[PDB]
Amino acid sequence: QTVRSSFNNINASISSINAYKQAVVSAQSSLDAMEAGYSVGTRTIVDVL
Amino acid sequence: LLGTQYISKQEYDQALADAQQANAAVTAAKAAVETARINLAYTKVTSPISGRI
Structure with missing residues (x-):
């Protein structure tokens, strides 16, 4: 149960990365x-921050 | 904001609808001034030809 826990943790945590690696690509x-929406003016500086 | 494709392509054209129709409204009001400017060429009654009065 311990070995399969870590092996099924790391198989999760790869997919957890590829989740939150996409969540960067979402948020980036x-x-x-x-930053393009504020440099032209449609969104404000707080909607940036 | 769509060179870098960061708004919808739809919301652009919808604003380009509003751009092109409001410039089509100015033309429908620059003519409406041209309707009422030409009343002020119809006041101050212009002698439509030359010659003796």
Whole structure:
């Protein structure tokens, strides 16, 4: 149960990374939608931050 | 904001609808001034030809 716990933790935690590695690519896209959206003016500086 | 594709392509055209229709409204009001400017060429009654009065 201990060995299969870690082996089924690391198989989760790879997919956990590829979840939250996409969640960066979401949020890095959403940030750059703000920095381009604030440099032209549609979104404000607090919707940036 | 769509060079870097960061808004919808739909919300752009919808604003480009509003851009092009409001510029089509100015043309529908610059003509409406041109309707009422030409009343002020119809006041101050212009002698439509030359010659003797």
